[PDB]
Symmetry: C3
Subunit: 533 residues, 3 copies
């Protein structure tokens, strides 16, 4: 077997030049297909040309920043030194201009929209002030991440809600998610048949959760999910001044659920502070997950708003966390260690597909059983309350009637008009005492009634509300914060870090309240930028 020995020596001799040449050939093939496509017809091939360009730019970009990091840094140092020399007097000029601009925007845009928009700005001040008064360390507050986290949300809103490019971008992005959730029907129509639509939620909606979970596991194997997380976590780290670990877990919670996002920093969890641990739990309570995103879109909830609320919830969570539990210790973990994300144990892309499908088995089982239980309890609670009410000639008493009054101040401060504030309060109740599946199922009913066009009042009962109030409700409800999830959060985190059980249990309730305040902050900014139709 001399030939077998020679072939071996060839490979080990020039392994780097063999495998690199192969990729280069593959790349040339792709580029040949693209250029040929544009030649045959450019307008038809435009989306394939755009994708190719943006990918090339980032590949080049990321390559340059990695090699010329030392040179770029020193080239920026003379400027940073000059600013720190004049910053003692220049800070009052920059602050004064920002304040002036906030006043001008209120006077000339918010005040024009109306009173409900001004009230939304007041709720932002009130929700923030209450977070300070009830802070763990009201004298230790670092105010930089509070003002940057609110400013970033406002900039995102302006771009996305108040410009055509950002509006067109997130309307397009939402329509792609709708098209993508239809592919699950091919799998659902074989396992459950052509009559799979006889059981809509079980045989059509839970397959979407399986498919999206499968896709997310493929993007983590490829390293595309980690590539976006580092980009977003760096913007928040360099503006807000937040620690690397809590910046990475916040950007990851935009796409990943609360029980899986701390795995992005699993080795370094036993050494995080009490404030970083609080931020890790707040970020999970203030966001949702991509696996369940398509389920809410299937109900009839706006895809654009869901995507916008999720992106705005990362800087809101860190701003409320750092104000509800500021940092009194010194952080140990550095940037390089936080940005490295130990990828899973999948040898190929088809093994990553099966691991994501197998992991979805327990998710869809718990979704289904919690909804059977919660909705049976509600039916019982409402029969008991009518039994009791009838003893005072008020058999209308319900869980909805009580929540319409208990949570109505929170909705009014988000800028919902008086009438609809009693209908939004009911949804805050469903989310708080049950979950956001229940709440979003009820909101979708209200959306459908309005689209039909029937009467708004029947026998003095309001049937549906405005579109602005459905928007504000979409942001307020976008989070995994509910009283029953407090134990699966504590347990899952202790499992990753058993040495910290004492600290985890102490920060979990404050983190759930901060999560709710974070989602309400997003709804006040949306409310102050949306007009009244």
């Amino acid at each position: 077997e001399r030939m077998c020995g020679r072939m071996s020596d060839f490979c080990r001799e020039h392994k780097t030049t063999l495998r690199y040449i192969i990729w280069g050939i593959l790349i040339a093939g792709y580029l040949a297909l693209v250029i040929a496509a544009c030649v045959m017809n450019f307008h038809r091939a435009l989306p394939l040309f755009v994708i190719t360009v943006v990918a090339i730019f980032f590949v080049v970009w990321d390559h340059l920043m990695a090699k010329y990091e030392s040179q770029i840094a020193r080239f920026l140092s003379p400027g940073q030194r000059l600013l720190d020399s004049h910053w003692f007097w220049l800070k009052w000029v920059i602050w004064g201009c920002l304040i002036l601009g906030v006043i001008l925007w209120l006077v000339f845009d918010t005040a024009k929209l109306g009173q409900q928009q001004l009230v939304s700005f007041g709720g932002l001040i009130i929700y923030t002030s209450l977070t300070f008064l009830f802070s763990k360390h009201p004298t230790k507050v670092y105010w930089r991440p509070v003002f940057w986290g609110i400013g970033l949300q406002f900039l995102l809103g302006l771009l996305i809600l108040r410009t055509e490019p950002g509006f067109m971008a997130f309307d397009w992005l939402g329509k792609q998610v709708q098209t993508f959730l239809g592919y699950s029907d091919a799998g659902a129509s074989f396992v459950f048949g052509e009559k799979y639509t006889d059981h809509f939620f079980a045989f059509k909606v839970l397959p979407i959760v399986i498919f999206f979970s499968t896709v997310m596991s493929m993007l983590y194997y490829l390293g595309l999910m980690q590539w976006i997380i580092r980009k977003v976590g760096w913007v928040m780290l360099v503006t807000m001044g937040t620690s690397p670990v809590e910046s990475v877990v916040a950007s990851g919670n935009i796409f990943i659920g609360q029980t899986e996002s701390p795995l992005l920093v699993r080795p370094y969890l036993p050494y995080v502070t009490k404030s970083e641990l609080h931020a890790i739990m707040t970020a999970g309570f203030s966001t949702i997950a991509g696996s369940v995103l398509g389920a809410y879109i299937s109900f009839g909830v706006s895809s654009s708003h869901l995507l916008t609320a999720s992106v705005m919830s990362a800087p809101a969570a860190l701003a409320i966390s750092k104000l509800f539990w500021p940092e009194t210790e010194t952080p140990k973990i550095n940037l390089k260690n936080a940005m490295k994300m130990e990828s899973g144990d999948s040898r190929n892309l088809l093994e990553a597909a099966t691991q994501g499908a197998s992991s979805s088995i327990s998710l869809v089982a718990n979704i289904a059983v919690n909804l059977i239980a919660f909705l049976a309890l509600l039916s019982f609670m409402n029969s008991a309350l009518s039994w009791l009410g009838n003893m005072f000639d008020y058999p209308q008493l319900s869980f909805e009637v009580i929540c319409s009054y208990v949570f109505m101040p929170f909705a009014f401060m988000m800028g919902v008009d008086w009438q609809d504030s009693f209908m939004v309060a009911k949804l805050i109740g469903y989310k708080t005492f049950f979950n956001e599946f229940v709440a979003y199922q009820q909101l979708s009913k209200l959306i459908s009634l309005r689209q039909v066009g029937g009467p708004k009042f029947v026998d003095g009962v309001q049937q549906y509300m405005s579109m602005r109030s459905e928007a504000i409700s979409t942001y307020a409800l976008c989070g995994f914060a509910n009283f029953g999830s407090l134990g699966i959060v504590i347990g899952g985190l202790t499992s990753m870090a058993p040495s910290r059980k004492r600290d985890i249990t102490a920060g979990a309730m404050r983190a759930l309240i901060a999560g709710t305040i974070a989602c309400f902050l997003t709804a006040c900014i949306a409310g102050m930028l949306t007009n009244t139709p």
Copy 2:
């Protein structure tokens, strides 16, 4: 933050007087609603007045017994000393009166009802005598728990089956369980749709098991389930003279399944004797669980009888256990340690709801798969037996035909008439070789046919039986004793106490036989008190 420091000092200074005042205000609110209700209309508010009274009585009762325990005990000591002085001659007078009363009841009530009722009394003597002859220690028998356990069942039967108050109480109690199992439909109609009734057992019955499991976990968090268990376990402990640990696990098995009720005494399991371990396994084999109670009621099985059989099965199990395996050692665990029941790890009532729903996932999965398997095996066994029978011109041979003859003596001794004893024997077979889901599904068929009113015989084949025989069958079938559950019992108990694997394995088969005898004892007492229609 001086105000924050002052507010802190106020709370830590008078924490006891702050939280107590709050509860007192809440209590005054409740009482105000009740009194106002009765004022507006008393007859309508009666059930809310009754509930409030019985709760107040027990709260006061339990408070007095806890404080004045030492005084009450000594006040009873002069009487107990006098009785132990005259007990040497007074024991013959009390025994003679009891015997006389048993004879008078047989002559003037049982003999009037008929021959089938007298046979039921004979089966009680025969089942008990066989338990002695085949005892582990026939010379070590302590006879006090054998005669009290039978007497308590007879008193319960008289009260519940032979008085209007006890009959009305348990008929009312059963109708509340029926109303309560309808709330699960609100959850089932969303997850599975309006067509959830196209798949009755899977999409309507298994949601009842989820809902009841959810509710039981809420009552354990509140401490209401443990409060009833201590009351019942104390009556059996003070009459029968049974050990605290086996008295607590028997009363808990009325409400809790066999794999979860030993958790009521998990710390003390490595130190229980061989007789207490046998009793722990017998009690689980002689009872059912609240989670599956509503499933059998959905079939059409009487709710009152199921509840009565479960309560009577606790003193029957201990009487048969102490006769099949008497105590030859000294018990270590005392009363205070057995009555303390380490409650779970739920921080609130909505976390207790989700833990009970999540735990039901594996229960309903195993119920469904065991029924697919058992009913497919039966179809195969019956085709093989017809194939074989046809070789002798008897293609009617079946599993039912064989069991109608093998188990017919056991049914006749419970007081079932000759004809119907061959139909009850088939049900004993289904339970023994399969489970009590199969058996109760078959009994419900027979109940429906009788209600319809068709012919009782068609072509010489009896279609349905009497109502007394459906009652006796309801008691005989109320237990988790079947040959296939012997391994999930051993495994689950070893997990809790790995040091005792050797003892657990030695007492498991004797405990399964004792379980069956215990359920048959209940059916003989029901049979001797029920009249022939």
Copy 3:
């Protein structure tokens, strides 16, 4: 209790003579029923007489071989010594006759059938030669198991495909499996109702997997599955010269899946060589399991071919394993230790039924979810490829079009005609990138279209292919080899033998490729023996 003491002494005194007499009475009862049946009517009782005879023969056979093993061995030694004396010149005579016979069979049978049959013989030479050239140790090849493993497949094919007795035997055997998969409907029609057929795959096909899994666990408790495995593993051990451990795991993989068959030798896994570990993984990739056999028959795939492919896949796997990774070490485990199979922990046959049902819960859950995911990915991949193709005026581009060209040479070498080789290539693709559920669902479509009788071409598109090509495809697709199963195999084996993780990971990819080559070897032998209709 003197009588209880005497009865005890009687049993302990003559326990062996008491329990043996009982079995003898039971046996006499069975024999009495059989003889009586034949007397009443022999032709009707024939299948019960045949079964009884074959059982008696093996019981006697196995008893004689166990007692007279030493005598038989020495009686054969003079013959074995004579052969090893004349074997130096007699080896050329036996080899020359075998070769001559292969030539005569090609000239006078294969060449008569046609060109597609001769090509199938060439593919056998080509697939085998490629396995050598790419071998791990091309200079260390022991050629005895390569020629015996191919010869055994050819003998099995001749017997089963080219004689009436073997054809009638495996057609009868397949019809019994069809009858047996109908009993699951009794269980499916109660859990899911009379409308269980509204969801065919979920509510009718997955109950077959539950029932077959239940039955296999009962046959392992009885020791009937281990009794067949030893018989088949001994033939391969005494002909091919393979190690005891890899002979036992190959025969067990005919009936048992790949994640459970190494449990037949769990204690001895830390001491197996690198070649035996490779063979253990190849055998699992080249076979299927009895639990999923009925699911493929429900699609419409031939029962006889599935059974034949499974039996032929055991000697093919060992022949390709020993050529792709020959043995360079010394094996430690001996025959007695490999043939002993530690049976499970079931105390009776009804506990073995419940353990097999409970184990099927995760199997049917993973089957269903992987199919929802794989079929949703396919729908997406095909829409993306049409989007891209349309940029060149070729919107027909699909995953099927690409696989019809990539895998067409592999199908042509198995002897599929030119036209149908593009349709078989699509199925090889489905299996490789997804699984054999997807592939067999697509093959069944093609079978049904042909049975209908419609047009074979519509608009230039071939709709169905020949019956010979459906046969060849049935053998090529009978294996659990796919890229996504590589991680559940590694993990499950490491769990059994954590010390070998390094070796397991190194042989897993070579074992998956060898698995595929093994299934393709079976299809070339089937193809060279099947005629063109």
